[PDB]
Amino acid sequence: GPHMRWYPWLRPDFEKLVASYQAGRGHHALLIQALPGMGDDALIYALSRYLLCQQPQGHKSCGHCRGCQLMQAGTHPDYYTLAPEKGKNTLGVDAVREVTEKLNEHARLGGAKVVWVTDAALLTDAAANALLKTLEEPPAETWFFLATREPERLLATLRSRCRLHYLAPPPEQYAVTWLSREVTMSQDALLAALRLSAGSPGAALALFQGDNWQARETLCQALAYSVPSGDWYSLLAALNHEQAPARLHWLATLLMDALKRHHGAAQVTNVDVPGLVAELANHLSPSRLQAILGDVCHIREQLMSVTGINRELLITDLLLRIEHYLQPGVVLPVPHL
Amino acid sequence: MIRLYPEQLRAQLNEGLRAAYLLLGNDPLLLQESQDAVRQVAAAQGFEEHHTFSIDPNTDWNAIFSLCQAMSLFASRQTLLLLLPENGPNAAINEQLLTLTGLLHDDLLLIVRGNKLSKAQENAAWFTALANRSVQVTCQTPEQAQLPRWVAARAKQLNLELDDAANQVLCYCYEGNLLALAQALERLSLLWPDGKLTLPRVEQAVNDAAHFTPFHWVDALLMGKSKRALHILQQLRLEGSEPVILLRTLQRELLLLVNLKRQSAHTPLRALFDKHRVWQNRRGMMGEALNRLSQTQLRQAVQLLTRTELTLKQDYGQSVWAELEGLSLLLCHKPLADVFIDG
Amino acid sequence: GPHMSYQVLARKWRPQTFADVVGQEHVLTALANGLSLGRIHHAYLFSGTRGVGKTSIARLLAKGLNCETGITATPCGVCDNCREIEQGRFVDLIEIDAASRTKVEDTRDLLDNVQYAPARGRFKVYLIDEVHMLSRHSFNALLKTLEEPPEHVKFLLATTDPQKLPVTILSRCLQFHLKALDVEQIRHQLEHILNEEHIAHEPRALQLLARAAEGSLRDALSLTDQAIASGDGQVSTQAVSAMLGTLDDDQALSLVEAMVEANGERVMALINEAAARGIEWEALLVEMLGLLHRIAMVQLSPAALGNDMAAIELRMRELARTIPPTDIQLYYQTLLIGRKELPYAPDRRMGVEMTLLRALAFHPRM
Amino acid sequence: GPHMKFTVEREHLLKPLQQVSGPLGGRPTLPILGNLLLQVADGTLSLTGTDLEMEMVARVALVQPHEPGATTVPARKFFDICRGLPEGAEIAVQLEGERMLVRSGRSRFSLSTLPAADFPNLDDWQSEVEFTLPQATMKRLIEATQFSMAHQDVRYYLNGMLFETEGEELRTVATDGHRLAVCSMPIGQSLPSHSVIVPRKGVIELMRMLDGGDNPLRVQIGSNNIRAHVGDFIFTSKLVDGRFPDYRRVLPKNPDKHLEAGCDLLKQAFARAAILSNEKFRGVRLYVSENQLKITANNPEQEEAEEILDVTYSGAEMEIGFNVSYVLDVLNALKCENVRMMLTDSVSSVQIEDAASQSAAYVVMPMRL
Amino acid sequence: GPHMKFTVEREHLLKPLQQVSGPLGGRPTLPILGNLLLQVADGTLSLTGTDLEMEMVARVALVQPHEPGATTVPARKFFDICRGLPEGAEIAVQLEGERMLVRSGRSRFSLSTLPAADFPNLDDWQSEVEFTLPQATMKRLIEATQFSMAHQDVRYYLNGMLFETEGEELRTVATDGHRLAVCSMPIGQSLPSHSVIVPRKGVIELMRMLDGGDNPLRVQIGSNNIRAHVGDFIFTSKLVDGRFPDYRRVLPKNPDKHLEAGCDLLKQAFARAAILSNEKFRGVRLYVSENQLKITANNPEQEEAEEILDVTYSGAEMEIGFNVSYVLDVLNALKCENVRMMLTDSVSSVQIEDAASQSAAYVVMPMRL
DNA sequence: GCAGACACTACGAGTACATA
DNA sequence: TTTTTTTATGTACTCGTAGTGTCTGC
Ligand SMILES: Nc1ncnc2c1ncn2[C@@H]1O[C@H](COP(=O)(O)OP(=O)(O)O)[C@@H](O)[C@H]1O
Ligand code: BEF
Ligand SMILES: [Zn+2]
Ligand SMILES: [Zn+2]
């Protein structure tokens, strides 16, 4: 399945990062600020391959030593992974505590040690705090790797004890060329997907590979039906899913582009769908458009943040409040200081 | 399989004991009464030695099978009793019951006590093997409407005079708690052996030890009975039920009401109810609600519901119990202030 | 120890005859009629509010069942076993604090002691206190014993939380539920003990003690003992009022009373008193918001008042009837905004005071 | 109260402490019931241990200056103190206030006691039967009727053992609802007929205290109490209230078909056939013909044990199902060499008895073929 | 080619297989973790079991001609497939695709396997130090200081033993910050100075591995793990990264006050005093005077215990309070005739050692109330 | 011994409750 | 006439199992 799919835009950075470890002066803790699915996992995996290799050469693992074989097999006494438990999107303090207690003993293979957390943004406060000191002063030859959507989203204490590497996304033309090579579809839709993925080619490619593109097309059609009539409730049929935050973000981008079109911005995030954005711009006043956009993004943040929240109630209430906002003579929310 | 109610058991027991008796219901009182009657009749007909067992992954089944296959030195007639788990007979338990039915003998009388049987549970072959010759007793708690008739019938059986007021008080104070209702009937009969019970006599020795379910609260909201809904809500809070259960139970119905009110502008409720598998009593209650609720009231109800959900889930606050009274007073007939619905 | 006054009123004034228990007629009459008419159950389970008489009434039942002058509601108190039950220990009355013996390894021994014939009395009497804390396996053992109880044993279980017991135990026990004592009954009893203890008293102090008792007679007796302590052997109105003010915890309700009354000095004094007790300020604001929500629900319908707020029912009802809804909504908005702004204040005390000052500015007095 | 004193040797004290420890030490119903009651009277020491239904009292001779006082000292602590002292060292004991002082060679302890007024004691009871018996007879009666005793049955009367006094004969009866065991022996004296139920703890302590030496065990039975004297050990207990079932009915009073065999051969054959029985439905089937008997067992493997020509029989063909555990237990407890086994019917009780004596009898109920 | 010809006899592997299994696959942590590796080399079959921390290898001698290689199989399946075979069995294991076929007469069974490349295992490594230890020597070394390990303490470096080798001497040091135990034994072998910190679990598993003076033990210590070869069994446990404290600076520097007593007398006295000591604070206060040791204790119930011992004491009168458990443990470990105690100050630690042999030392740190 | 018996102590599991 | 519950971590409690100290007639 999904594995170390190396990406070209990681080449300038990887060769740099291994250098920081080749001289032996590298930081034990490297927090990667990379967009999801952009390639942070593959880069961290390759770095760990270099680190745990007993007889490495240049900028790649030998693939012959027993450390390389064990790493390939997925089992290694000196390669700990911290990933959310199956069916739960969080990293418990118990796993971090077990890993930290295991770090006390020496490395079995006589080499170094690697502790890789799949996503530091999913750390529970207790787990991140249990990892604080382990991050600060690890034992001899211990290496930590962290990945995050946003470093500032992490705990203000954990992020302090870590060298932060930022993976710059490729320029839009390079990304669209890469995805055109990977996917044979229209340029407009490809650019729209890249802008939707905040310029990250990996996320746009994953969006096209999955059914998310069909869902986006269905949501665009539902919006086209609902904008002139105000039948926003039907949007529920397209909005309620296990990937609801992504579709809410798509709606937010559409509202972004409607406000841009009213202001006349040269480029828009949704370039593949001009009819819907034009309909939104002409039908809805900017004053109510801003309120709808703010409420949609607030609902998205609430849905992402608090675990166990019910998607049905939140999405239905968002749609009903949007329909209420559409009616004239209704006060609008104002951002709170 | 003769399916009966506890009213008709006596005659059946006088007709002759059956190989197996399945006491199935959600009501402890009727189950216990049927079990006591069965055991009394069996003791009258020679069944002297009584054995009781609890079904459990910790049950020493081999002992049960040996007892069913071993004769006793005294009182060869034996009665076997089992207590079904809250989940009913599991697949392994179904096989165990099939093996027990295989060893069923004329001299052995079997009694089963537990919750209701779900369709899959009696689908298992052992149920039919028993049903070839057995009796099943449905001890289901009477609903709100059927309670006064049952209370009056038991009062006439117990030889005490109840008026309408005392019956209403007993129904209002003991709903879903028929065990406590019979305890109260015994208490009132023993307190005043005159046999005449009225409002002043019964208003003293009756407490509000009712047992409710979230469905009762939702149906009270649907029918528009605000006082009954508040009573159910307070009783459920005192019981300690999780408020998220109430939130989900109300949310399902409220979303259905919102969808049907949206669709009522094009299609009558008669077809709309048949579209989404709404039952007859539910059809009547839902039609009454949809006729007595507008769009604005439903929208405000959903707004208050999502505010309560956000308070419960991300703030871990303890104001959900007080806030649910907001929905209770908003749905029935009374619009509520804006600040209490959004903020 | 030294001097007879050491006897705690919660212990010395333990009822000894059915004529001494007060306010529990609906159970006393039932027990008397059952004992006299021969009607009897295998087990009797008592329940109700704390300090109402469940254990005392259970001990009275144990006295009545085991008097050689016949099974009767009223024991003589002269013979050997009647005194042995109260003074000293009686062999055939087995008193088990279930909280101390939750594990099944003790209930197993207890039910191994049920097959033995009673020594003195006819009925082997078991009194198990706080039966709602027994373990699940102990509950299974107790149910097994209760399924076929020998004719010479009758159980007595006393508890405060009946909801925790297995339904199969409730099914075989004729539960007696004891209602919380009324204010008048508590006051009359307190007057009775105070007059019969040669302790001076004043009626307003007795009314205050009864109101502060929250319905439990043990609370009233303890506050009476403290009132006698606070002073020189005299229950004075001033001493009782000062003690209750020291122990009072309804700062939020009196504070909203003063706020709606627009009495700024009263609100400030109440905030001072709450500060003296170290009251959590955010908890105070939360409780005030709850009170305002409840009073609004009362305004919408009088059914919003349940049995959970029976102590403050009259005050909330009268403050609902006299105050228009608009003032309630404005005060709720002001207090919610103030709680939102409370953490970002110089300190919690000044923040909550500033919120109250904001609320008082609406519809002020001359 | 105060002034009470001991001066006792460890050898003369250790064994009675072990005897009186019994069930004490665990969490008691009352805090006092963890303390041995120590008493002095007429120059002898009395140790008392109580369980609200038991009382074990040990008497120790005193030949040292002392004082007739009483106290209650924790059983575990006092026994540990008396055990940890050097061998042959004398313990000197006194009381002061609420502190009991123990002294040995350059060693002093203070222990917290409780007043003797609060110690429970078994109420005085008028005896109905007096009895004297050698230890060997009582041990034989108990050992041959303890295995077939009910275990935690919901029926109270089946718990414990039944004592029968009939003429010049003492009888012990045990029943678990499927098995019955009766062992009856002469005693050399005539007694009024009496039926008395003794609990499981009572028979356990009766069996434990029995000694291998010659001793006239002096039993004393009242309306609802039992007491036994073994030298200086006096053990009393309550009686299990109830109605033990009549043993004279279920036994094969008038049998017809019977078998004669050797106990060892039947034990070996039953053990061999035990492996031929599944754990569920764990039983055997005895198929008996003229001087023939095979033992099988229901099992998916479908095996058999076949030794027909090693038994005596004077009847017709029968096939009767037993439980292997019950027959194994009764054969092992019988311990004799020649065994008689009366087969009244295929659906009636079956008797197992000593073919060379009449001291014991056992009744086993077949289980549905 | 899929050769994998294993030709072994069952009874010669069941005990090794149970040994190497030990904590066999019961943890769902990793599918490969719950497996055992079969390897052929040096004319012998190596059975390897490892859970990424502890590795155990049994080197069983082969019977018939073999075919070298390695493959891993489910441990529980192999354990159960050879534990029920009647007496001996000619276990013939063959490779078919990804399968082991086990044959013995008319008994053919299958076990799905995994390649040995996936199984984590340790190859040859340069040992930092090598020991040829008699079994009795290491048994005494670990036994006399195993009670001094820290049981899951915050200081992670104290969670094990310090094996310090110096010259021709091997020392073990174990402490938890309250007690300390040092045991040094000669080896007659010039060995480089080294320090090892073996965890608690590793030393416990090593201790329950060696027995019988007939098979000398071979210890190989590297920079990251320790291996022990007892006969044909090999154990491997990782080391602790911490640094053990300098024990020679923990022992008192100037123990002016000397005491000598009998080991049995001290042990009996300490147990006797601990009978009435506090339940969770088992500490005695000890006074030394001229040829006299007074040990006293009490509990919250104020049941004081006091004893006096005739000792050979050199020094001034002194008071020191220390816990009883550590000193009873030290006295039990020192299976000697005379115990020598070193005391410096009423606030200083106490040294305990054998008076007749300078081979062990213990430090007890007193209680400051 | 001794091993069984018994005593005792520890670990896991299942359940219940509290908190944010 | 069948329908409804959020998490993460920790703290007790009560029971069977499980492994081991120890020691008494075996
Ligand atoms: N109904 C009552 N009548 C008289 N005294 C009472 C009553 N209820 C409580 N008390 C007083 O409180 C003391 C303790 O009462 P108790 O019955 O033990 O309360 P609980 O219900 O909490 O077990 C009694 O000694 C008595 O003084
Ligand atoms: F105060 Be009671 F005995 F629960
Ligand atoms: Zn490599
Ligand atoms: Zn009397």
Give an account of the 3D structure.
Chain A is 52% helix and 7% strand. Chain A is built from 14 helices and five strands. In chain A, strands 2-3-4-1-5 form a five-stranded parallel β-sheet, sandwiched between helices. In chain B, 56% of the residues lie in helices and 11% in strands. Chain B has helices spanning 9-15, 28-44, 61-69, 91-102, 119-123, 125-131, 147-157, 164-173, 178-191, 199-202, 214-223, 226-239, 243-263, 269-275, 280-292, 295-313, 320-331; strands at residues 2-4, 20-25, 49-54, 78-83, 108-114, 135-139, 161-162, 196-197. In chain B, strand 4, helix 4 (91-102) and strand 5 (108-114) form a beta-alpha-beta unit. The longest helix of chain B is centred in the C-terminal third of the chain and has 21 residues, at 243-263. Classes of the chains: A alpha/beta (337), B alpha/beta (343), C alpha/beta (366), D alpha+beta (369). The B-C interface holds B 28-29, 32, 50, 52, 54, 179-180, 183, 186-187, 190-191, 193, 204-205, 207-209, 226-227, 230-231, 234, 237-240, 319, 322-323, 325-326, 329, 334, 336-337, 339-340, 343 and C 25-26, 29-30, 33-34, 37, 39, 140, 144, 147-148, 162-163, 167-168, 170-171, 174-175, 177, 179, 286, 289-290, 293-294, 296-297, 300-301, 303-304, 306-308, 325, 329, 332-333, 336. Bound molecules: adenosine-5'-diphosphate (ADP), beryllium trifluoride ion and zinc ion (2 copies). Beryllium trifluoride ion is lined by residues 50-51, 55, 129-130, 158, 160 of chain C. Chain B binds a DNA duplex (20 and 26 nucleotides) through residues 58, 213-215, 218, 241-253, 277, 279-282, 312-313, 315-317.
Write the layout of secondary structure elements.
This is part of a larger assembly, with 1 copy of chain A (337 residues), 1 copy of chain B (343 residues), 1 copy of chain C (366 residues) and 2 copies of chain D (369 residues).
Chain A: H1 11-22, E1 29-33, H2 40-52, H3 66-73, E2 79-82, H4 93-103, E3 113-117, H5 125-136, E4 142-148, E5 163-166, H6 172-182, H7 187-196, H8 201-209, H9 212-229, H10 235-239, H11 244-263, H12 274-283, H13 286-305, H14 311-326
Parallel strand pairs in A: 1-4, 1-5, 2-3, 3-4
Helix pairs in contact in A: 1-2, 4-5, 6-7, 7-8, 9-12, 11-12, 11-13, 13-14
Chain C: H1 9-12, H2 25-37, E1 43-48, H3 54-65, H4 80-86, E2 93-97, H5 104-112, E3 124-129, H6 136-147, E4 153-158, H7 167-171, E5 176-178, H8 183-196, H9 203-212, H10 217-229, H11 237-247, H12 251-260, H13 264-276, H14 281-300, H15 313-321, H16 325-341, H17 348-360
Parallel strand pairs in C: 1-4, 1-5, 2-3, 3-4
Helix pairs in contact in C: 3-4, 5-6, 8-9, 9-11, 12-13, 12-14, 13-17, 14-15, 14-16, 16-17
Chain D: E1 6-9, H1 11-21, E2 35-41, E3 44-50, E4 54-61, E5 70-74, H2 75-84, E6 90-96, E7 99-104, E8 107-112, E9 127-133, H3 135-143, E10 161-175, E11 179-198, H4 200-209, E12 217-222, E13 225-230, E14 233-238, H5 247-250, E15 257-262, H6 263-274, E16 284-289, E17 292-296, E18 304-306, E19 312-313, E20 318-322, H7 324-334, E21 338-343, E22 350-354, E23 360-364
Antiparallel strand pairs in D: 1-6, 2-3, 2-5, 3-4, 4-14, 6-7, 7-8, 9-12, 10-11, 11-23, 12-13, 13-14, 15-19, 15-21, 16-17, 16-20, 17-18, 21-22, 22-23
Helix pairs in contact in D: 1-2, 6-7
The complex binds adenosine-5'-diphosphate (ADP), beryllium trifluoride ion and zinc ion (2 copies).
Chain B binds a DNA duplex (20 and 26 nucleotides) through residues 58, 213-215, 218, 241-253, 277, 279-282, 312-313, 315-317.
Pfam families (chains D, E): DNA_pol3_beta, DNA_pol3_beta_2, DNA_pol3_beta_3
Subcellular location (chains D, E): Cytoplasm
Region (1) (chains D, E): 4-123
